[PDB]
Write an enzyme that holds these catalytic residues in place. Structure first.
Site: not given
Ligand code: ATP
Ligand code: ADP
Lengths: 525, 209
Positions: A334-335, A388-389, A416, A493
């Site tokens: 998501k980030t 972020d979180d 708001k 991930k």
């Molecule tokens: N299509 C895609 N969408 C999202 N992330 C992608 C994609 N392709 C590759 N990635 C990679 O996947 C990883 C996603 O990690 P990220 O930290 O965003 O997960 P998160 O769910 O936000 O983290 P957490 O599990 O801690 O909540 C990044 O390294 C990103 O570059």
């Protein structure tokens, strides 16, 4: 002897060395010093006192002290007494007041010796809002710096009059200063020094490149219009630094026609100067690592929605503030998608707020940090702030439940509050627990929600593997036959971790291990 | 002369436009001292600081032959959160004591309050300290929706006919602020799908009371 010669024999405005302020100076001149140049006869006949000081506030680095010194050098005044706020305080009883009382000595002496024919004395303060704060009233709750303020108020306007003084204050927090220190009797004129626009940058570049132009050291390709358009939210200090870095880089290149050229300026701008009210590539490089590959339609849908929201917030005036929330199961990436939606916006000001930089902070410090980020965000004409979180800021933990209440109220109030007149903002959130956020009634503050799905089919997994490019065709066929049944539910991930954990196994005990790990992970909705 | 201090409470559903009406009522009274005590100027404060700020405003209100102080979004001042429950008690006690203190001899006052959760206030014994209440309703009937659309003056005639045809045979439960937001959100499509997306969004948001 008529004291109409306070004006220095020769003065131009633009030649002073200040460029970017043309209405501030006009209003200051009209409202403050129009009675120091008129012939003394009329001023005496009308019988009016003179303004006894002014206040200047704005961001840090926009040229406040310069204007104060120029004001002083205008009126044939004496040498200003520059002072610093936190350098006056002291630990013994009766020391801070002694320091504060030693600045008005010469004015009083020269008032005694020559009454009504003395010369202007100027005092320049700095960070005034560190000594003077609102005074308490409740008995037993009076502050610890309630004597400095009294000793300053009793001197600016007291029982014995000084008519040969002028006090200038400079600060960045106009709302922490006392209320009895701003009545029309003392420090009554207030002015704001804001970030410059295109014309301001053009003049500030002309002023600082006049020397090079006169000395014949500028090439015939360097044009200032494009260099002014390029820099978006630069102050003055970062423009002068850019010019200096350009000259230094050109000189270093000469060592191996020492005339700067487009390439030198571009390289210096790209790799030497980092604005504090502008975008930064470091955050994007650190958060979006391993790129953004495509493995289905949902990525396209999410990006399309983000683009539409950006366009709305840019091209509307009934709603100058927008919000959105990205929520999905954990490990779904998501980030990265948020940082991608932000990087394609082309906004002058972008900043990310994450808890990675607040390890061990008490909740009050976290409130302060968030507030400071938003306060900076309110100074530009476009912005984009990412949180972020939204579950690690609250310190949520299922037992109890337990969390912090101060931060939650701060966050619920900051979603708001609209920016000052004619400015715009955009906020992107991110979380993995929609329901808990719904319980605290914060899920209706966000204008809209978006969903970030997970892998749910075999061919999507196969295409992701193809894009990542780690296995051969025969292995791909084996995996396709083994996982043909579409019962795959994994993050994006976690797939990288599964691949990387298996690649370091053995020549041909790899695919077996990968299949075993994929099966053991499970699959539930 | 037997009632120098008055009070009133404006309450209703969310996104219904409460603070604007309180501001208008304060503006159209011609009093010489009008002040607003909102909670977005107290971000990060503690309980005692909030107490002192409210007390300072009220103290300033006692040196003028007429006054009108507005106190909006009470639940944010109290820091309510349904889990728990959890809130601040000291601010509540200060607020409950400042609502029935008369000014010095011969002077007058008028306090207006705004909230969106009336039942929680009733539990804490606060509807007993006010003198009356007023109700701000949401949009209820489709003809009102059409009238608001025309007054805003956004959609054209034939589009108006389509919207009226599909939205004049049922119920509607929408706030005004949310209506502005939906119109602006829908205006971003190509000139062909605007009405369709507006209807889709209105249908999605449409929820039972
Ligand atoms: N299509 C895609 N969408 C999202 N992330 C992608 C994609 N392709 C590759 N990635 C990679 O996947 C990883 C996603 O990690 P990220 O930290 O965003 O997960 P998160 O769910 O936000 O983290 P957490 O599990 O801690 O909540 C990044 O390294 C990103 O570059
Ligand atoms: N309007 C301006 N025109 C030209 N230079 C400026 C201007 N404002 C700031 N500067 C540059 O900034 C520097 C001084 O900044 P300073 O007055 O210390 O900022 P602050 O008052 O915020 O501390 C000078 O070197 C000057 O060249």
């Amino acid at each position: 002897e008529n004291r109409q010669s306070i004006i220095n024999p020769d003065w131009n405005f633009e030649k002073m060395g200040i460029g970017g302020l043309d209405k501030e100076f006009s209003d200051i001149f009209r409202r403050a010093f129009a009675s120091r140049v008129f012939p003394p006869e009329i001023v005496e006949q009308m019988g009016c006192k003179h303004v006894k000081g002014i206040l200047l506030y704005g961001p840090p680095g926009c040229g406040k002290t310069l204007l104060a010194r120029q004001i002083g050098k205008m009126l044939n005044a004496r040498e200003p007494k520059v002072v610093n706020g936190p350098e006056i305080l002291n630990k013994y009883v009766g020391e801070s007041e002694a320091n504060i009382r030693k600045l008005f000595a010469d004015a009083e002496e020269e008032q005694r010796r020559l009454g009504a024919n003395s010369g202007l004395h100027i005092i320049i303060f700095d960070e005034i809002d560190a000594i003077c704060k609102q005074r308490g009233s409740m008995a037993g709750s009076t502050g610890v710096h309630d004597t400095v303020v009294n000793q300053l108020l009793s001197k600016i306007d007291g029982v014995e009059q000084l008519n040969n003084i002028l006090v200038i204050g400079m600060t960045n927090r106009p709302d922490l200063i006392d209320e009895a220190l701003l009545r029309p009797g003392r420090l009554e004129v207030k002015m704001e020094i804001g970030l410059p626009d295109e014309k301001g940058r053009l003049q500030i570049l002309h002023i600082h490149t006049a020397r090079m132009r006169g000395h014949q050291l500028l090439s015939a390709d360097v044009d200032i219009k494009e260099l002014a358009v390029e820099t978006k939210n630069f102050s003055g200090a970062e423009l002068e630094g850019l010019v200096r870095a350009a000259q230094s880089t050109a000189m270093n290149r000469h060592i191996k026609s020492l005339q700067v050229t487009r390439g030198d300026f571009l390289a210096s701008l790209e790799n030497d100067i980092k604005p504090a009210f502008g975008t930064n590539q470091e955050d994007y490089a650190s958060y979006i690592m391993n790129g953004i590959i495509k493995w289905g339609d949902p990525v396209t849908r999410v990006l399309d929605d983000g683009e539409l929201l950006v366009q709305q917030t840019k091209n509307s005036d009934r709603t100058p503030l927008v919000s959105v929330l990205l929520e999905g199961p954990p490990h779904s990436g998501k980030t990265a998608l948020a940082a991608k939606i932000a990087e394609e916006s082309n906004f002058p000001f972008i900043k990310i707020c994450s808890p990675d930089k607040m390890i061990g902070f008490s909740e009050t410090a976290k409130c302060q940090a968030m507030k400071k980020i938003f306060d900076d965000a309110y100074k530009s004409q476009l912005s984009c702030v990412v949180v972020d979180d939204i579950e690690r800021l609250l310190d949520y933990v299922p037992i109890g439940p337990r969390f912090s209440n101060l931060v939650l109220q701060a966050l619920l109030v900051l979603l708001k509050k609209a920016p000052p007149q004619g400015r715009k903002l955009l906020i992107i959130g991110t979380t993995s627990r929609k329901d808990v956020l719904q319980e605290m009634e914060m899920l209706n503050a966000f204008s809209t929600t978006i969903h970030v799905p997970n892998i749910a089919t075999g061919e999507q997994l196969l295409e992701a593997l193809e894009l990542l490019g780690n296995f051969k065709d025969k292995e791909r066929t084996t995996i396709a036959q083994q996982v043909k049944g579409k019962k795959v539910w994994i993050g994006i991930k976690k797939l990288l971790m599964l691949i990387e954990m298996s690649l370091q196994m053995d020549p041909e005990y790899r695919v077996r291990k990968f299949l075993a790990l994929l099966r053991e992970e499970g699959a539930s909705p």
